[PDB]
UniProtKB/Swiss-Prot annotation, chain B:
Regions that span the bilayer: 1-30, 72-108
Residues on Extracellular side: 31-42, 69-71
Designated name of the protein: Transient receptor potential cation channel subfamily V member 3
Function comment: Non-selective calcium permeant cation channel. It is activated by innocuous (warm) temperatures and shows an increased response at noxious temperatures greater than 39 degrees Celsius. Activation exhibits an outward rectification. The channel pore can dilate to provide permeability to larger cations. May associate with TRPV1 and may modulate its activity. Is a negative regulator of hair growth and cycling: TRPV3-coupled signaling suppresses keratinocyte proliferation in hair follicles and induces apoptosis and premature hair follicle regression (catagen).
Binding site for Na(+): G60
Tissue spec: Expressed in keratinocytes and hair follicles.
Positions spanned in the full protein: 579 to 693 of 791
Family of this protein: Belongs to the transient receptor (TC 1.A.4) family. TrpV subfamily. TRPV3 sub-subfamily.
UniProtKB/Swiss-Prot annotation, chain C:
Locations listed in the record: Cell membrane; Cytoplasm; Lysosome
Gene giving rise to this polypeptide: Trpv3
ANK repeats, residue ranges: 1-15, 51-73
Section covered of the full-length record: 348 to 462 of 791
Function: Non-selective calcium permeant cation channel. It is activated by innocuous (warm) temperatures and shows an increased response at noxious temperatures greater than 39 degrees Celsius. Activation exhibits an outward rectification. The channel pore can dilate to provide permeability to larger cations. May associate with TRPV1 and may modulate its activity. Is a negative regulator of hair growth and cycling: TRPV3-coupled signaling suppresses keratinocyte proliferation in hair follicles and induces apoptosis and premature hair follicle regression (catagen).
Expressed in which tissues: Expressed in keratinocytes and hair follicles.
Name under which the protein is recorded: Transient receptor potential cation channel subfamily V member 3
Subunit architecture: Homotetramer. May convert from a homotetramer to a homopentamer to allow pore dilation. Interacts with TRPV1; may form a heteromeric channel with TRPV1. Interacts with SNX11; this interaction promotes TRPV3 trafficking from the cell membrane to lysosome for degradation.
Superkingdom of this protein's organism: Eukaryota
Swiss-Prot record, chain D:
Record gene name: Trpv3
Physiological role: Non-selective calcium permeant cation channel. It is activated by innocuous (warm) temperatures and shows an increased response at noxious temperatures greater than 39 degrees Celsius. Activation exhibits an outward rectification. The channel pore can dilate to provide permeability to larger cations. May associate with TRPV1 and may modulate its activity. Is a negative regulator of hair growth and cycling: TRPV3-coupled signaling suppresses keratinocyte proliferation in hair follicles and induces apoptosis and premature hair follicle regression (catagen).
Assembly and binders: Homotetramer. May convert from a homotetramer to a homopentamer to allow pore dilation. Interacts with TRPV1; may form a heteromeric channel with TRPV1. Interacts with SNX11; this interaction promotes TRPV3 trafficking from the cell membrane to lysosome for degradation.
Protein name per its UniProtKB record: Transient receptor potential cation channel subfamily V member 3
Expression sites (tissue/organ): Expressed in keratinocytes and hair follicles.
Subcellular location, record wording: Cell membrane; Cytoplasm; Lysosome
Similarity remark: Belongs to the transient receptor (TC 1.A.4) family. TrpV subfamily. TRPV3 sub-subfamily.
Source organism (scientific name): Mus musculus
Segments on the Cytoplasmic side according to the record's topology features: 1-64
Covered residues, full protein: 694 to 757 of 791
Length: 526, 115, 115, 64
């Protein structure tokens, strides 16, 4: 305070490399101004000392384009690691300014402080901003939550939907759903305006478009199965019924034509969806774009079986059978619409990654290891000239040890072995390692995985259904988006209309007299 | 028994029949006409026969013969091992793990439901 | 302390930082710089690294008598010192050990199978 | 612990001039005529607020 009165510049910028570090262990980014340093290092007395000085530029902006409110979002962390002082510095600076100028300012990559919290995954600052209700009378215009009426326990609130709904570009809802970088997307969609807004989209249009998507893809797999199972099975009856290369005036020939149309509609539409969303990270393919990738492969093999048919290579029938078996396995995508079967498909994804792939690595090491050792111990079968042993090859001994595991066939030890006791020692050692050890430890490890992901399988399901809703919304035309629009215009303040969303509550603990309602008459008027 | 059938067995039987009828058509349409040996060349000749052979494969009865009348014998073996991994390794072992989750919850309440 | 397995005395001695000015030479941890939250420390490596004989690192790894070796290697100078050895030379020698022993099992399998 | 036993056996077999090349640490003037070959670890703490006395360097950057 002595240096301030003596005339030090309160608007200096620290532009060095230490104050803009490349890595987190190199320096300390705080916002480059002495106002941002006092705010980010938990010194509230120097902050309110600086804001009283009339030379203080509170809307200044650094080299990144950040202001004081962008800088507090960047340094925010959890409750456990840091504290909740960043949430209190955000509130104290905002109420001192008194207008919307800090909240609508955009940095160099074009983000407001509200969009920057959702981009980086700051779940505690984002919870504050969306439900911000100010009871004070002159500063009530800075709120985003308004109490419409109240009577006893019952109350009705209004949430502002300005940049959180998908009417503009880069909404809060769009950034959270499509953010492959952060790893807490499924915790940020439980917030109280974002939870109701997805439930309203599912009731009005998304559940009916999800049922029409199911019926077309079911009929596509029926008419692909029937024209492949009921072929003309002769060499004289050579032409294939698909694409209708011979006109015999057959009724319902469009079923051979509906396959070719709908296969090109898929492979074009799935080639675009892969081309736009390109992850280089492997963990984003298996988490977000598995069914985008596997609907495209199934649709290419149907198209490829036609162009390979006209060249008469007689290898088209390999491509159709792969197209049927992959086609009926893709019907497990449509379990998203139900909660009970949708949480069950999240279990299958976590069990294959964590348990089955570790099992199959160690199993093939034992199968191919004991398979060579048994196969090189059998003599030549020219003494009986046929049928002396079933372990004569490497291909035969691997097949016999695989049937031994799943329990098929019969066990014969009267082989053509050079050493018959050594053949039995290696075979019982195989049964102990696989039947007793590995297959029973697989059950014990799956019970460890199920116990952990049962806490999270509901929130992972709601993230997967939320991605379906926002893709149905992008394809329907513009005049449908005006018809299925959520919210209602509300006279919030003097000449302020904000298109808000209404949510009702009941509270039995907090008793208080009601001031700062909007309406006196507490009913549902009209 | 009442809580296990509702929560575990019916979800298992829905996904199992999708895989059984799905791989059953794919294997059955890959077998040729059996008029070269005139009898007994393949046991996957029909849709009714291939569904029966994949059901005996799950409960462990019979014998596994791969010398079929297939047009493509390596493709027939790839689809058959893919069926064993999905049902014998994945679905039947995850059924045991999910029942242990149900038993742990309803053991707190099974006495009061009985009364 | 490392020979007998005294994990609480050993944690004290390795991270010993004395803020007092005349007795600051008795420390084994020094603050190099600091600015706000961020800071940089220096840990002494006199008898804990494997340059001499009977280091603290060598005694803890090879001590068959005690039964808490895996808790004593999480200490803050001993944890980083093993991570630095793995990045510079140990991971490349571990890959060369794998390739020789893999080729040794291939050429033992092939000359025994194809007699 | 099992990977740590692998690291110390690879270190005993490589020759002496390799051990000088792959050496950890750096000489630091700790006090008056005291050099100790120390190891550097960075931290971030958001709870403990205090003014900083008893640093070694005034300039808080990665010098060179
Ligand atoms: C615990 C139980 C489960 C274990 C599972 C692992 C078991 C491993 C399998 C064990 C048995 C398989 C080998 C037996 C050999 C058969 C004989 C044969 O014909 O050999 C042939 C080669 O063999 C192949 O080409 C195999 C083809 C399948 C490859 C592996 C399946 C991939 C599954 C992935 C699916 C992912 C599922 C999705 C997961 C989410 C060659 O025979 P040949 O002598 O050269 O004769 C000439 C050929 N001719 C006759 C045409 C002219
Ligand atoms: C600290 C302890 C560590 C391990 C200790 C060992 C150290 C490492 C040693 C390793 C092997 C040393 C023996 C090498 C030569 C033997 C091979 C041989 O001659 O075949 C013989 C079998 O012999 C076997 O089956 C032995 C197989 C290993 C058993 C080792 C004990 C494992 C304990 C597990 C449980 C006990 C299992 C008992 C065994 C079933 C018999 O041959 P044949 O088929 O009858 O042929 C007829 C002969 N004719 C054709 C010429 C007419
Ligand atoms: C994990 C293991 C378990 C999996 C279970 C699921 C396995 C699924 C089953 C798999 C195998 C069944 C199909 C094999 C076909 C046999 C051949 C056949 O005859 O086909 C026949 C049809 O087939 C039928 O009609 C089947 C009848 C049973 C229906 C399903 C059982 C309901 C169980 C509910 C009980 C609830 C229990 C209560 C629960 C609390 C027709 O054959 P065809 O060619 O037309 O020949 C002409 C007929 N003729 C000869 C008379 C003239
Ligand atoms: C990012 C990664 C995603 C997946 C990558 C692929 C992308 C999607 C691609 C999809 C299919 C592309 C190939 C289509 C045509 C092949 C069919 C064919 O010709 O039959 C062949 C088999 O060929 C197979 O078995 C391939 C089956 C799919 C294996 C794909 C790898 C899965 C990995 C799982 C583990 C590896 C399994 C290895 C395979 C066992 C052989 O035919 P045949 O029976 O010998 O007949 C004799 C020929 N004759 C009759 C004319 C004389
Ligand atoms: C009021 C509520 C509805 C209002 C709006 C409805 C109009 C819609 C307006 C425009 C939609 C344009 C569709 C684009 C075509 C591309 C084809 C395609 O890829 O499949 C698309 C077809 O799924 C649907 O979109 C269903 C809606 C189409 C219905 C068209 C008219 C109905 C005619 C019939 C009248 C029957 C009458 C019966 C009732 C009387 C979507 O594919 P997907 O499944 O999303 O992708 C696969 C999943 N994946 C993400 C993993 C890859
Ligand atoms: C390209 C072919 C692949 C199959 C080949 C096997 C080798 C491939 C290599 C590795 C195997 C795959 C690793 C598993 C990865 C996750 C699986 C999964 O998504 O779980 C799903 C369970 O529903 C299923 O998809 C289970 C069936 C697996 C494929 C079965 C093969 C079908 C037979 C065809 C035979 C011929 C094949 C012809 C072509 C070769 C549901 O999980 P989720 O929670 O919904 O997560 C998805 C996230 N998302 C919804 C937002 C997107
Ligand atoms: C059925 C199985 C049999 C065997 C199948 C074999 C393979 C099985 C494979 C996978 C298993 C999964 C099977 C998928 C079943 C349907 C898909 C689905 O999820 O539906 C969903 C939506 O569907 C509905 O809304 C219900 C139908 C109402 C009428 C819709 C007609 C649309 C036309 C009218 C418009 C004109 C448009 C035309 C002109 C443009 C169900 O959603 P829900 O949960 O019930 O909704 C309640 C949600 N709530 C609880 C949150 C409030
Ligand atoms: C035992 C006495 C004799 C048997 C009865 C006699 C036969 C009865 C005939 C038909 C009854 C079929 C089931 C309907 C009731 C299910 C209730 C349920 O919880 O399912 C759930 C999902 O379950 C699914 O729906 C997934 C798809 C399975 C196919 C059934 C679709 C129903 C359409 C019928 C087509 C007919 C074809 C059927 C062919 C057999 C409902 O979804 P959810 O509610 O959103 O999620 C639950 C979680 N929550 C409650 C908290 C939200
Ligand atoms: C179906 C068969 C065809 C597929 C085969 C293609 C291979 C690659 C296919 C899919 C990619 C697998 C990794 C996915 C991405 C990482 C995420 C993950 O969940 O990793 C998990 C599995 O990771 C493992 O440890 C697997 C070890 C064996 C891999 C090879 C088995 C091949 C099966 C046939 C063998 C013969 C083939 C020869 C192989 C040389 C790590 O498990 P976790 O401990 O729970 O860690 C938590 C997750 N974390 C890492 C994010 C922290
Ligand atoms: C879900 C799964 C996804 C991935 C699928 C995984 C693959 C599935 C697994 C297996 C499928 C393939 C089995 C049969 C192979 C065909 C025959 C062949 O090529 O062998 C030939 C060469 O064989 C040799 O020379 C001896 C073996 C040398 C290497 C030793 C292997 C041990 C590796 C262990 C460590 C590695 C494992 C580490 C962990 C991964 C000999 O052929 P033959 O028997 O003499 O045939 C005679 C008939 N003929 C005369 C007509 C020609
Ligand atoms: C034995 C075979 C004959 C019966 C078949 C008749 C069908 C209908 C029969 C009985 C009615 C089933 C629902 C009961 C009423 C709801 C209560 C409940 O416990 O739901 C549970 C099961 O709900 C499911 O999710 C089942 C999904 C598959 C249903 C169809 C399987 C048919 C089996 C053969 C396949 C071929 C048939 C083709 C089917 C298209 C929900 O599980 P949860 O997650 O623990 O939820 C907690 C409970 N809650 C919902 C109250 C919150
Ligand atoms: C606990 C359980 C309770 C419920 C019970 C459940 C039922 C039990 C399951 C199965 C029992 C029935 C099995 C055999 C059927 C009898 C034969 C038949 O009708 O097929 C005929 C038509 O077949 C075709 O046209 C090809 C198949 C078309 C549809 C593809 C099915 C895949 C659906 C997957 C998704 C749906 C599943 C989604 C999830 C549910 C052909 O018959 P054939 O072989 O040529 O016969 C020749 C002999 N003959 C000449 C004398 C005539
Ligand atoms: Na059996
Ligand atoms: Na049997
Ligand atoms: Na268990």
């Amino acid at each position: 305070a002595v240096l301030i009165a003596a005339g030090a510049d309160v608007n200096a910028h620290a532009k060095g490399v230490f104050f803009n570090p490349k890595y987190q262990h190199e320096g300390f980014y705080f916002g480059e101004t002495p106002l941002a340093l006092a705010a980010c290092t938990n010194q509230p007395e120097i902050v309110q000392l600086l804001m009283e000085n009339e030379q203080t530029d509170i809307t200044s902006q650094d080299s990144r384009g950040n202001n004081i409110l962008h800088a507090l979002v960047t340094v925010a962390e959890d409750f456990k690691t840091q504290n909740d002082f960043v949430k209190r510095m955000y509130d104290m600076i905002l109420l001192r300014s008194g207008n919307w100028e800090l909240e609508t300012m955009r940095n160099n990559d074009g983000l407001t402080p509200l969009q920057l919290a959702a981009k980086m995954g700051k779940a505690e600052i984002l919870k504050y901003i969306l439900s911000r209700e100010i009871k004070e009378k002159p500063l009530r215009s800075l709120s985003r939550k308004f109490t419409d009426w109240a009577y006893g326990p019952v109350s009705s609130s209004l949430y502002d939907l300005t940049n959180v709904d998908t009417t503009t570009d880069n909404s809060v809802l769009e950034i959270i759903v499509y953010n492959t970088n952060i790893d807490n997307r499924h915790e940020m969609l439980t917030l109280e305006p974002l939870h109701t807004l997805l439930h309203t989209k599912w009731k009005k249009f998304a559940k009916y478009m999800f049922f029409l998507s199911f019926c077309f893809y079911f009929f596509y797999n029926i008419t692909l199965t029937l024209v492949s199972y009921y072929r003309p099975r002769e060499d004289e009856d050579l032409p294939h019924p698909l694409a209708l290369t011979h006109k015999m005036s057959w009724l319902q020939l469009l079923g051979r034509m509906f396959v070719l149309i709908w296969a090109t509609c898929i492979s074009v539409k799935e080639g675009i969806a892969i081309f736009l969303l390109r992850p280089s990270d492997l963990q984003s393919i298996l988490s977000d774009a598995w069914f985008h990738f596997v609907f495209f492969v199934q649709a290419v093999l149907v198209i490829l079986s036609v162009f390979l048919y006209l060249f008469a290579y007689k290898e088209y029938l390999a491509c159709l059978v792969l197209a049927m078996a992959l086609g009926w396995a893709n019907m497990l995508y449509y379990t998203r619409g139900f909660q009970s079967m949708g949480m069950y498909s999240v279990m299958i994804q976590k069990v294959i990654l964590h348990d089955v792939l570790k099992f199959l690595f160690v199993y093939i090491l034992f199968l191919l290891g004991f398979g060579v050792a048994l196969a090189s111990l059998i003599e030549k079968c020219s003494k009986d000239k046929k049928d002396c042993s079933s372990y004569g090859s490497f291909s035969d001994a691997v097949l016999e040890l695989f049937k031994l595991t799943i329990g098929l066939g019969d066990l014969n030890i009267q082989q053509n072995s050079t050493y018959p006791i050594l053949f039995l020692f290696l075979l019982i050692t195989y049964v102990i390692l696989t039947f007793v050890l590995l297959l029973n430890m697989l059950i014990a490890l799956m019970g460890e995985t199920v116990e952990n992901v049962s806490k999270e399988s509901e929130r992972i399901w709601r993230l997967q259904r939320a991605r379906t809703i926002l893709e149905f919304e992008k394809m329907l035309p513009e005049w449908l988006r005006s018809r299925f629009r959520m919210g209602e215009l509300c006279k919030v303040a003097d000449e302020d209309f904000r298109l808000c969303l209404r949510i009702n509550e009941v509270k039995w603990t907090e008793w208080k007299t009601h001031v700062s309602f909007l309406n006196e008459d507490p009913g549902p008027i009209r």
